[PDB]
């Protein structure tokens, strides 16, 4: 089984890439529960830009061919109380997705649930023993709510919803 | 000078949705976060959300979560909060205010205030 | 959930005279702190950022000051224009709010 996303327009085989990379945005306000929700990064490309984990590929809500861990997921931030800095998320193994051409790129589905589980270990780190929880994009325009990228001079927008749909405990 | 001029204040019945704008002037509207904060006749103040103008992303108090949408308009320089099914909890004054440098959270400038009445 | 904590709800004091305003966090928050001032009718007025650096064009009478769990605005000698609400900030969370009234 794999993960579907819609691409727009259909991106070419050769532009398959290997996920390194995340950016995320931390949901403000509480629920009065031990619930932590994290979303695709609202913010802009100065956010993308300060991660530092990214490769020659200009992406959107996804590093690819970027930078990898050496050992273990690496989470960053410049500031983890403040909802309005994004989280750099580095990955150790990357996880590839695959363009077939057709209008969709495939994500298998049990590589991804285990990084997204790898992430919130990490996350729980800092923000304490917690559930965390993914959720879709809050909104925006179409290269940030959508997961983009160039390839071979044209631009691709893939929806990432179902790639943050999880809660892990 | 720097201004926040926001719209006009509406009345509502309940249940019904509400579009409130806040148009920015003489400083560059896509580099500098807009919040909305909310205050009910009397009481403190309550930080609804935060958009990006550059990029229109946004993140939204979880109180406020399925209930609230913020937008805008760069040519315009404007700023939309909308808020559904309005209840009578929801009447209060609300501001747009726009953070000192990119990101902050210090508030440096405020709109008027926009009220909203949610009576029958 | 992070709280702030503002006491008292409401300070008396006589005109002319220094006021001291709390401020307390449930838990340790870093030093990243703003105070704003309402008078009635008005959107809120930013005072200190930073927890003790004044925005521009505020007198020098008020002042902040604190760290970890406690902070504190002080108004070193109160004026007419002066009695109002004001609120202590750190990042999405606000205090409910402190009213400076006149002690007669």
């Known amino acids: 089984d794999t993960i579907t996303l819609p691409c727009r327009p259909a991106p070419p085989p050769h532009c398959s890439s290997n996920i390194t990379g995340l950016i995320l945005t931390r949901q403000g306000g509480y629920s009065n529960a031990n619930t932590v929700i994290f979303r695709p990064s609202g913010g802009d490309w100065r956010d993308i830009a300060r991660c530092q984990i990214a490769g020659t590929v200009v992406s959107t809500q996804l590093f690819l061919n970027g930078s990898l861990a050496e050992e273990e997921v690496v989470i960053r931030s410049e500031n983890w109380t403040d909802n309005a800095k994004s989280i750099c998320v580095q990955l150790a193994t990357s996880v590839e997705i695959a363009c077939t051409g057709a209008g969709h790129c495939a994500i298998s589905r049990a590589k991804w649930a285990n990084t997204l589980k790898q992430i919130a270990s990490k996350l729980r780190e800092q923000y304490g023993a917690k559930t965390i929880i993914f959720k879709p994009s809050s909104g925006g325009d179409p290269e940030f709510v959508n997961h983009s990228f160039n390839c071979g001079g044209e631009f691709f927008y893939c929806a990432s919803t179902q790639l943050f749909a999880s809660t892990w405990f | 000078q720097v201004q926040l001029v926001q719209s006009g204040a509406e009345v509502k019945k309940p249940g019904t949705s509400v579009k409130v704008s806040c148009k920015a002037s003489?400083?560059?509207?896509?580099?500098?976060?807009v919040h909305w904060v909310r205050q009910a006749p009397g009481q403190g103040l309550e930080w609804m959300g935060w958009?990006?103008?550059?990029?229109?992303?946004?993140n939204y108090a979880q109180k406020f979560q399925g209930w609230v949408t913020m937008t805008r308009d760069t040519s315009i320089s404007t700023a939309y909060m909308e808020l559904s099914r309005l209840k009578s909890d929801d009447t209060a004054v609300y501001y747009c205010a726009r953070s000192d440098y990119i990101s902050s959270w210090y508030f440096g400038y405020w709109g008027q205030g926009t009220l909203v009445t949610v009576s029958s | 959930e992070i709280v702030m904590t503002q006491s008292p709800a409401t300070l008396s004091v006589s005109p002319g005279e220094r006021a001291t305003l709390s401020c307390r966090a449930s838990?340790?928050?870093?030093?990243?702190l703003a105070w704003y001032q309402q008078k009635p009718g008005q959107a809120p007025r930013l005072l200190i950022y930073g927890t003790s650096t004044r925005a521009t064009g505020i007198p020098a009478r008020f002042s902040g000051s604190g760290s970890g769990t406690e902070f504190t605005l002080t108004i070193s000698s109160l004026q007419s224009e002066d009695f109002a609400v004001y609120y202590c900030q750190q990042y999405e969370t606000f205090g409910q709010g402190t009213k400076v009234e006149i002690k007669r």
């Open positions: 838990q340790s928050v870093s030093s990243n």
């Open positions: 958009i990006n103008p550059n990029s229109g992303g946004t």
């Open positions: 003489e400083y560059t509207f896509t580099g500098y976060y």
